[PDB]
Design an enzyme around this catalytic site. Structure first.
Site, PDB file in Angstrom:
ATOM      1  N   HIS A  22       0.832  -1.199   0.000  1.00 50.01           N
ATOM      2  CA  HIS A  22       0.000   0.000   0.000  1.00 50.01           C
ATOM      3  C   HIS A  22       0.873   1.257   0.000  1.00 50.01           C
ATOM      4  O   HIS A  22       0.863   2.024   0.975  1.00 50.01           O
ATOM      5  CB  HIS A  22      -0.954  -0.013   1.218  1.00 50.01           C
ATOM      6  CG  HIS A  22      -2.078   0.957   1.098  1.00 50.01           C
ATOM      7  ND1 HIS A  22      -3.378   0.610   1.448  1.00 50.01           N
ATOM      8  CD2 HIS A  22      -2.136   2.242   0.618  1.00 50.01           C
ATOM      9  CE1 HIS A  22      -4.173   1.673   1.248  1.00 50.01           C
ATOM     10  NE2 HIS A  22      -3.434   2.685   0.742  1.00 50.01           N
ATOM     11  N   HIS A  74       2.030   4.956  -1.506  1.00 48.64           N
ATOM     12  CA  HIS A  74       1.798   6.107  -2.384  1.00 48.64           C
ATOM     13  C   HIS A  74       3.168   6.669  -2.773  1.00 48.64           C
ATOM     14  O   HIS A  74       3.944   7.074  -1.913  1.00 48.64           O
ATOM     15  CB  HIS A  74       0.987   7.178  -1.624  1.00 48.64           C
ATOM     16  CG  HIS A  74      -0.397   6.727  -1.265  1.00 48.64           C
ATOM     17  ND1 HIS A  74      -1.538   7.222  -1.921  1.00 48.64           N
ATOM     18  CD2 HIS A  74      -0.858   5.837  -0.341  1.00 48.64           C
ATOM     19  CE1 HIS A  74      -2.614   6.639  -1.404  1.00 48.64           C
ATOM     20  NE2 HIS A  74      -2.234   5.789  -0.455  1.00 48.64           N
ATOM     21  N   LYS A  95      -5.822  -0.334  -8.619  1.00 44.15           N
ATOM     22  CA  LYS A  95      -6.366   0.160  -7.363  1.00 44.15           C
ATOM     23  C   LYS A  95      -7.710   0.794  -7.684  1.00 44.15           C
ATOM     24  O   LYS A  95      -7.789   1.704  -8.534  1.00 44.15           O
ATOM     25  CB  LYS A  95      -5.455   1.247  -6.774  1.00 44.15           C
ATOM     26  CG  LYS A  95      -6.079   2.031  -5.601  1.00 44.15           C
ATOM     27  CD  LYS A  95      -6.200   1.145  -4.339  1.00 44.15           C
ATOM     28  CE  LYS A  95      -6.704   1.956  -3.138  1.00 44.15           C
ATOM     29  NZ  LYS A  95      -5.678   2.913  -2.664  1.00 44.15           N
ATOM     30  N   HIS A 104     -10.348   3.132  -5.945  1.00 47.09           N
ATOM     31  CA  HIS A 104     -10.386   4.017  -4.803  1.00 47.09           C
ATOM     32  C   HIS A 104     -11.659   4.850  -4.898  1.00 47.09           C
ATOM     33  O   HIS A 104     -11.973   5.371  -5.961  1.00 47.09           O
ATOM     34  CB  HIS A 104      -9.185   4.989  -4.844  1.00 47.09           C
ATOM     35  CG  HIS A 104      -8.910   5.645  -3.523  1.00 47.09           C
ATOM     36  ND1 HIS A 104      -9.735   6.671  -3.007  1.00 47.09           N
ATOM     37  CD2 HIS A 104      -7.909   5.457  -2.626  1.00 47.09           C
ATOM     38  CE1 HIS A 104      -9.217   7.072  -1.833  1.00 47.09           C
ATOM     39  NE2 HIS A 104      -8.095   6.340  -1.583  1.00 47.09           N
ATOM     40  N   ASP A 128     -12.120   7.826  -4.165  1.00 47.52           N
ATOM     41  CA  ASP A 128     -11.940   9.180  -4.677  1.00 47.52           C
ATOM     42  C   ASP A 128     -12.031   9.251  -6.194  1.00 47.52           C
ATOM     43  O   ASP A 128     -12.155  10.359  -6.729  1.00 47.52           O
ATOM     44  CB  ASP A 128     -10.607   9.831  -4.243  1.00 47.52           C
ATOM     45  CG  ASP A 128     -10.494  10.186  -2.771  1.00 47.52           C
ATOM     46  OD1 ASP A 128     -11.335   9.713  -1.928  1.00 47.52           O
ATOM     47  OD2 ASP A 128      -9.477  10.823  -2.445  1.00 47.52           O
ATOM     48  N   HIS A 146     -10.215   0.328  -2.037  1.00 46.59           N
ATOM     49  CA  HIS A 146     -10.650   1.221  -0.981  1.00 46.59           C
ATOM     50  C   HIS A 146     -12.089   1.583  -1.339  1.00 46.59           C
ATOM     51  O   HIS A 146     -12.332   2.247  -2.348  1.00 46.59           O
ATOM     52  CB  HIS A 146      -9.706   2.443  -0.929  1.00 46.59           C
ATOM     53  CG  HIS A 146     -10.204   3.637  -0.154  1.00 46.59           C
ATOM     54  ND1 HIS A 146      -9.351   4.423   0.650  1.00 46.59           N
ATOM     55  CD2 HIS A 146     -11.431   4.238  -0.092  1.00 46.59           C
ATOM     56  CE1 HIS A 146     -10.023   5.430   1.167  1.00 46.59           C
ATOM     57  NE2 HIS A 146     -11.309   5.342   0.740  1.00 46.59           N
ATOM     58  N   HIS A 186      -6.643  -1.424   4.050  1.00 42.44           N
ATOM     59  CA  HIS A 186      -7.038  -0.891   5.364  1.00 42.44           C
ATOM     60  C   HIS A 186      -8.446  -1.360   5.729  1.00 42.44           C
ATOM     61  O   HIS A 186      -9.384  -0.555   5.826  1.00 42.44           O
ATOM     62  CB  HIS A 186      -7.001   0.652   5.448  1.00 42.44           C
ATOM     63  CG  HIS A 186      -7.398   1.368   4.198  1.00 42.44           C
ATOM     64  ND1 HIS A 186      -8.662   1.231   3.650  1.00 42.44           N
ATOM     65  CD2 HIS A 186      -6.698   2.218   3.389  1.00 42.44           C
ATOM     66  CE1 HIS A 186      -8.756   2.007   2.565  1.00 42.44           C
ATOM     67  NE2 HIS A 186      -7.538   2.597   2.359  1.00 42.44           N
ATOM     68  N   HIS A 202     -11.315  18.040   6.097  1.00 40.36           N
ATOM     69  CA  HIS A 202     -12.312  19.076   6.323  1.00 40.36           C
ATOM     70  C   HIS A 202     -11.711  20.436   5.923  1.00 40.36           C
ATOM     71  O   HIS A 202     -12.409  21.181   5.200  1.00 40.36           O
ATOM     72  CB  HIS A 202     -12.820  19.030   7.774  1.00 40.36           C
ATOM     73  CG  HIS A 202     -13.616  20.229   8.191  1.00 40.36           C
ATOM     74  ND1 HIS A 202     -13.454  21.492   7.620  1.00 40.36           N
ATOM     75  CD2 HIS A 202     -14.564  20.381   9.139  1.00 40.36           C
ATOM     76  CE1 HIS A 202     -14.281  22.351   8.181  1.00 40.36           C
ATOM     77  NE2 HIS A 202     -14.976  21.692   9.113  1.00 40.36           N
ATOM     78  N   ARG A 250     -16.520   7.254  10.893  1.00 40.40           N
ATOM     79  CA  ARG A 250     -15.303   6.754  10.234  1.00 40.40           C
ATOM     80  C   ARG A 250     -14.207   6.306  11.220  1.00 40.40           C
ATOM     81  O   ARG A 250     -13.526   5.307  10.972  1.00 40.40           O
ATOM     82  CB  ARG A 250     -14.798   7.691   9.114  1.00 40.40           C
ATOM     83  CG  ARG A 250     -13.546   7.200   8.378  1.00 40.40           C
ATOM     84  CD  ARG A 250     -13.101   7.949   7.118  1.00 40.40           C
ATOM     85  NE  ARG A 250     -11.717   7.690   6.693  1.00 40.40           N
ATOM     86  CZ  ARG A 250     -11.189   7.909   5.469  1.00 40.40           C
ATOM     87  NH1 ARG A 250     -11.925   8.399   4.473  1.00 40.40           N
ATOM     88  NH2 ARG A 250      -9.913   7.610   5.244  1.00 40.40           N
ATOM     89  N   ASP A 301       0.426   2.450   3.793  1.00 40.07           N
ATOM     90  CA  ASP A 301      -0.328   3.609   3.301  1.00 40.07           C
ATOM     91  C   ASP A 301       0.576   4.847   3.288  1.00 40.07           C
ATOM     92  O   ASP A 301       0.120   5.981   3.575  1.00 40.07           O
ATOM     93  CB  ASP A 301      -1.613   3.862   4.121  1.00 40.07           C
ATOM     94  CG  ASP A 301      -2.767   4.397   3.269  1.00 40.07           C
ATOM     95  OD1 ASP A 301      -2.516   4.957   2.155  1.00 40.07           O
ATOM     96  OD2 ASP A 301      -3.941   4.208   3.694  1.00 40.07           O
TER      97      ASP A 301
END
Ligand SMILES: [Au+]
Ligand SMILES: [Au+]
Ligand SMILES: [Au+]
Ligand SMILES: [Au+]
Ligand SMILES: [Au+]
Ligand SMILES: [Au+]
Ligand SMILES: [Au+]
Ligand SMILES: [Au+]
Ligand SMILES: [Au+]
Ligand SMILES: [Au+]
Ligand code: NI
Ligand code: NI
Ligand code: NI
Ligand code: NI
Ligand SMILES: [O]
Ligand SMILES: [O]
Lengths: 100, 564, 122, 564, 100, 100
Positions: free
Chosen positions: B137, B139, B220, B222, B224, B249, B275, B323, B333, B357
């Site tokens: 995992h 990035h 992947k 995801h 998003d 994810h 995760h 946020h 969450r 991650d």
């Protein structure tokens, strides 16, 4: 200044030692890297002061004691070695079992 | 002539029945067996055994059963066992685990483990040796992340990213043929093994598949990018055809479906659930139920590992670099009930893998560190596992070492090359002083050459004087970086000649056999079960039994070791 | 006179989003026991099966909210939302696989929706 | 549904009529227009717009109008305007400036700016985006200079040098075929674009021309090699034949001629006049009169920029790393009257370019920094320019941004590749937080991949924790350094196959169209005039009008930002 | 000492903080990087002392005030984040708007 | 903090100066690199304080004297140069023959 590679790296040891000494001053028991930094910097400053290898081998056994460090740290440190420029050139100091 | 055991262990490392503490944890591993012949142990130095005519054979050319490298007296910790052996390497692969030396004069010499003129020696007496860690995992956001990984014993990075672009900062994705080619080229300069994941998103096959043909090693999905029924379905159709893994994810928001909808889109096909506890992302609040299914290969990322007094607070403000609707979302969450249960699911063999991650919501240099912290916390709270004997933690140690070595390698389709200390596999090996085990690697070997080492002043008479720090070694320099590292790629990209087309000089590894596996294929971590997550209370049950745990105020492998 | 480095001085007035497109208000229920958040640009008829509303009224539409924001439905929550019209070619592909073409194909969209158990097809 | 403007700007960056302060200066730029459709803005993240079936198209392969990278919501500051747009990149070039997204469902999508499976995302909302800086006065003396340049938003280095040899320490020269070949090879390892200048000295054509054929991109005439009538004449004859630019540092000593003699040797041919004010070198005291001529492309180097209380003192002792005849020479060379007037000539559009003079008498990381300091000082002393509207500084901002982007690119013959954010040009782009604008770049993109970024702890869960510092990114690693950077070379060296002959793997850029330009071709800086410099008083007049200015005690973009 | 990459980098933060604190001691209003260094080093030393994340989130809002820094600096600093080894391992601290 | 390359390097000079000043405090005659570090750091701190180039050119001649340094060091140091951010931006300070 003409810093060579070792002079640049060894500035880091002095810096870690300063950090560790402030930590000790505020009452913390010191960890493994903190302890090693303090004793290593002590040795290099000792050579700068013009002490002999023999003096620093003795003194290095008394810079920190077990009550200054966390549980297990004395036993983690079997030796600390440092090279520094003495009045007679670079020499190696090895301190065996520096913390009891 | 007899040697008592204390002196024996000092000189040659421990032998059968001896135990070793892992760092400052209360975990003890025990030597299960020893391949040596007592009195003919190999060792190197003045007046020692590996000398010409003696433990070193003076007759044979390198082709005649002679090793390029012998690790002497290694204490191996691996899914395959905890045992004492010499390890022989040749052509960058592990060729022999057994007893090295000279059959001229020694008994019990493994026939292809001759020390000859061609043989280099690493003394592993008093060290623990494991496989390199496999982090699935990753990035790719900041190249400085590689040394961080190497320093904690990681040797393979699987993930995606183009640097600190927002897509890469959120998702393990290198999108599309051109970004993939560019990152394969970049990889030529990274001293670690790599496989790249494309974007597992689209409603037509071709935009997804062209990423595999361009040289991606997996996909992947995801949220998003839209973790919708369509993107899930098309990705798995691609993966089944291409023989690569898909990581997911899932849709935390439950926008297009709840967990049961995600499983329906998956439709019994293989998938790696990232995760799986869900703080790092996924169907709120019940994503972790994934880990009970036979077609799911479940991993944790590392910030929830293990559950501590600061965990929730750190995760709360962490979700503010992000946020009433915000608070509700955060509360849905970040859940003490699932993070707590995640500890126990690890201990039970229900979550099969760890991962970082790295730089997105996890620490590049703490996959291995936190695996052992978790095992130690579980021993402290749950006691020795039922399966243990002799007062050792061997069973737990094999279950936990599997989570970051063999299990990710199996999941990704690369376990034929990496993930364990077995004959025939690439010689990615990490030496650890037991006092630093899982904290700071002593030497990381990549393809049979040291790539990374904690070592001291380069201007000194000897290499031990201060300052001792992590440094890149000769395996990383010049062209040797190509021979000591593997770029893992899809079969189609390899058959289409992508390496020659891009001028890649790294060893090329083939991704394969990852459509025909499941939970049962996860070594020591093969448990399927009904996981229930109560939608009101977030209480976790496993076959009707409630799983609670509690946070600890302190961990081993922490303030004793780290300068910051 | 106080300098805030890089500060904005924004002009007066307001930005109307989705100007000139038809708006539609509908009631929507989360019949599920877990929360659902719906983003600004998902084809509304393709949202979570357990949201109950008149599915016909979501076809060719999305939430009339600022680009990149989301409406939130707690478990059991019913509330009104305002929809705006999709633009460009008015085609949708993927997502829940209910459309895969023109949004004008209302009967085909609703047939797929009903067969797969998206709540509120008449 | 309406969004007030403050929240709109927070979320998506500013829109038409909104203004933004540049760092801590009193310069304000105003959004002139916006390519968006309100309500269909692109953005990336959880529950955001660029998701499959939504703002991301799930149908099209990368060839079908799909981007490799979209910068969302960028505030562009460029000679071509100050405006809000998405920027689409593909094959390492800017292919679209407009509105990116998915024509399935969004209005106003620029047809070749589809976000697809293949598309990476950079969020530029709330950022200013400019072209990379083009520094045309670089001494290659110390490779550490490159990161210095990248950190202040420079992406192209034109100049000369072989490292800290005295020739290179004084002059932007890589002399002769062999030194040029060696530095082209060196360039393969430098993560920035490069063009190399040969020695513009000789009395026969062939010794000069052979440098162009060996791969130089231009020539430098410098007084330290003999800036005589002959060297000037032969260099310009070479340049006219080869289609490359010549830069001149003229004869400060007036040994073989005064300024009028230099202009006669030039004979109406194109030339780039370096550090035209003359502290950096040239005919004492009147060199700056060059900047009035139609065939002269005039640049400043940066230490005189802008005029401050410490300027003269620093330049006085600076000219001692060099040393009655000495004092006279210094007094003839370091002149408050010309340095003062240099400020105003910049503001009037009479000096067209900035540059560093990196490591010879200028600062590698301060070309962009000092451009804005100068503009801010001019606004403080002269007021808004006549041309301004709406209380904005847009006109001055376009005049000043031109000085370090498009104008050097035009002068050097490379504006077809670099120097502005326009469709068809290479994707060298710099993102800036407005609070750091012109001080410290956020992300520097080279050929569509991030090369340099201010980013934090590589061991952290996310990339923002301390320490945040400038770091090389993946575009600089392995083979990707070749694809993300351009070596600019003469047409003859390219036609003769020099890249293949030397094994260069970098993108090769062609120098062209720089014999057929003049002052009028300098964007926003195109003014020709009679400049008089009084030989007794050094008073500067422009068409009979005296130009005086005064030094300031303080600058913005200084002690608020820098640790030293 | 066995320094890993993060331990080496983070020595720099302590050093910048020491530099900034001397500057403050001689009466200077602090700039942007000085302010960030001081608060960041405060957080990492706090973790070394064994404080909780929650304590450091509160205390980090009171290390420097607007009168300690130059005009505009408070508004330049929206958040400061640091990771450090607490007694329970590495954790992230984020301090929002540390200087008003 | 947004450190650029020069800000990172120059932290080293401050650190060397701190090391040298401790050495001087314990009574050592300073060597070549120690002397250069002390005077260089003095200049950069002076610029941070808002002094002019002209003041620092004068003051830099009086930071160390020959009795503070070892034999030959005064003659080894012909000039010390440093660039730092003054209130009016980066400027170069050169101190000729700083130690007599
Ligand atoms: Au989040
Ligand atoms: Au986030
Ligand atoms: Au909150
Ligand atoms: Au709150
Ligand atoms: Au996160
Ligand atoms: Au000079
Ligand atoms: Au000079
Ligand atoms: Au003088
Ligand atoms: Au004088
Ligand atoms: Au100069
Ligand atoms: Ni995730
Ligand atoms: Ni991730
Ligand atoms: Ni010059
Ligand atoms: Ni120059
Ligand atoms: O993640
Ligand atoms: O120059």
């Amino acid at each position: 200044m003409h810093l060579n590679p070792a002079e640049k790296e060894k500035l880091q040891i002095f810096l870690a030692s300063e950090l560790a000494l402030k930590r000790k001053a505020r009452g913390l028991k010191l960890n493994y890297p903190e302890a090693v930094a303090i004793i290593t910097s002590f040795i290099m400053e000792g050579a700068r002061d013009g002490k002999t290898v023999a003096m620093l081998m003795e003194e290095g056994k008394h810079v920190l004691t077990r009550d200054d460090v966390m549980e297990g740290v004395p036993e983690m440190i079997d030796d600390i070695q440092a090279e520094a420029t003495f009045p007679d050139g670079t020499k190696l100091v090895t301190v065996h079992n520096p913390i009891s | 002539m007899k040697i008592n055991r204390q002196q024996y262990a000092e000189s040659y490392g421990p032998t059968v029945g001896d135990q070793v503490r892992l760092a400052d944890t209360d975990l003890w591993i025990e030597v299960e067996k020893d391949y040596t012949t007592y009195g003919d142990e190999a060792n190197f130095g003045g007046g020692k055994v590996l000398r010409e005519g003696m433990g070193e054979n003076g007759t044979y050319t390198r082709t005649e059963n002679v090793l390029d490298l012998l690790l002497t007296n290694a204490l191996i910790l691996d899914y395959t066992g905890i045992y004492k052996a010499d390890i022989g390497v040749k052509d960058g692969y592990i060729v022999g685990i057994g007893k090295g030396g000279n059959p001229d004069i020694m008994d019990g010499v493994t026939p292809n483990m001759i020390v000859g003129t061609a043989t280099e020696v690493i003394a592993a007496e008093g060290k623990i040796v494991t496989a390199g860690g496999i982090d699935t995992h990753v990035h790719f956001i900041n190249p400085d992340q590689v040394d961080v990984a190497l320093a904690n014993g990681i040797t393979t990075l699987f993930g995606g990213g183009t640097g600190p672009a927002e897509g890469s900062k959120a998702t393990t994705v290198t999108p599309g043929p051109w970004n993939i080619e560019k990152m394969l080229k970049s990889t030529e300069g990274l001293p670690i093994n790599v496989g790249i994941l494309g974007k597992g998103h689209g409603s037509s096959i071709a935009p997804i598949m062209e990423q595999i043909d361009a040289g991606a090693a997996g996909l992947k999905i995801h949220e998003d990018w839209g973790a919708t029924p369509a993107s899930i379905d098309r990705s798995l159709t691609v993966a089944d055809e291409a023989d690569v893994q898909v990581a997911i994810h899932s849709d935390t928001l439950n926008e297009a479906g709840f967990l049961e909808d995600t499983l329906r889109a998956i439709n019994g096909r293989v998938i790696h659930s990232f995760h799986v506890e869900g703080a790092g992302g996924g169907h709120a609040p019940d994503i972790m139920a994934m880990a009970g299914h036979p077609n799911v290969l479940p991993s944790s990322t590392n910030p929830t590992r293990p559950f501590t007094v600061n965990t929730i607070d750190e995760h709360l403000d962490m979700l503010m670099v992000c946020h009433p609707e915000d608070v509700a979302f955060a509360d849905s969450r970040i859940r003490p009930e699932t993070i707590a249960a995640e500890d126990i699911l690890h201990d039970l063999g229900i979550i099969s893998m760890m991962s970082t991650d790295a730089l997105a919501m996890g620490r590049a240099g703490e996959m291995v560190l936190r695996t052992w912290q978790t095992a130690d916390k579980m021993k402290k709270q749950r006691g020795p596992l039922a399966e243990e004997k002799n007062g050792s933690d061997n069973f737990r140690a094999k279950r936990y070492v599997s989570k970051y070595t063999i299990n990710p390698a199996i999941a990704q389709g690369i376990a034929h090359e990496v993930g364990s200390i077995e004959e025939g596999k690439f010689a990615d090996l990490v030496l650890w002083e037991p006092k630093f085990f899982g904290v700071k690697a002593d030497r990381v070997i990549k393809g049979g050459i040291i790539a990374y080492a904690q070592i001291g002043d380069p201007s000194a008479s000897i290499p031990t004087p201060q300052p001792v720090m992590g440094r890149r070694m000769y395996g990383t320099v010049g062209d040797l970086i190509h021979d000591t590292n593997i770029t893992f790629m899809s079969k189609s990209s390899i058959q289409q000649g992508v390496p020659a087309k891009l001028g890649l000089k790294r060893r090329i590894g083939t991704v394969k056999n990852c459509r025909n596996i499941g939970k049962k294929d996860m070594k020591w971590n093969d448990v399927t079960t009904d996981i229930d997550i109560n939608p009101e209370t977030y209480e976790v049950k496993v076959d009707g039994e409630v799983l609670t745990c509690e946070p600890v105020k302190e961990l081993p492998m922490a303030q004793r070791y780290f300068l910051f | 006179n106080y300098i805030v480095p890089g500060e904005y001085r924004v002009a007066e007035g307001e930005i109307e989003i989705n100007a000139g497109r038809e708006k539609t208000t509908i009631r929507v229920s989360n019949t599920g026991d877990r929360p659902i958040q719906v983003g600004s640009h998902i084809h509304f008829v393709e949202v979570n099966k357990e949201l109950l509303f008149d599915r016909a009224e979501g076809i060719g539409r999305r939430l009339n909210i600022p680009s990149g924001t989301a409406a939130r439905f707690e478990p059991g929550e019913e509330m009104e939302v305002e929809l705006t019209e999709l633009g460009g070619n008015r085609e949708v592909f993927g997502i829940s696989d209910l459309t895969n073409g023109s949004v004008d194909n209302k009967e085909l969209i609703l047939q797929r929706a009903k067969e797969l158990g998206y709540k509120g097809v008449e």
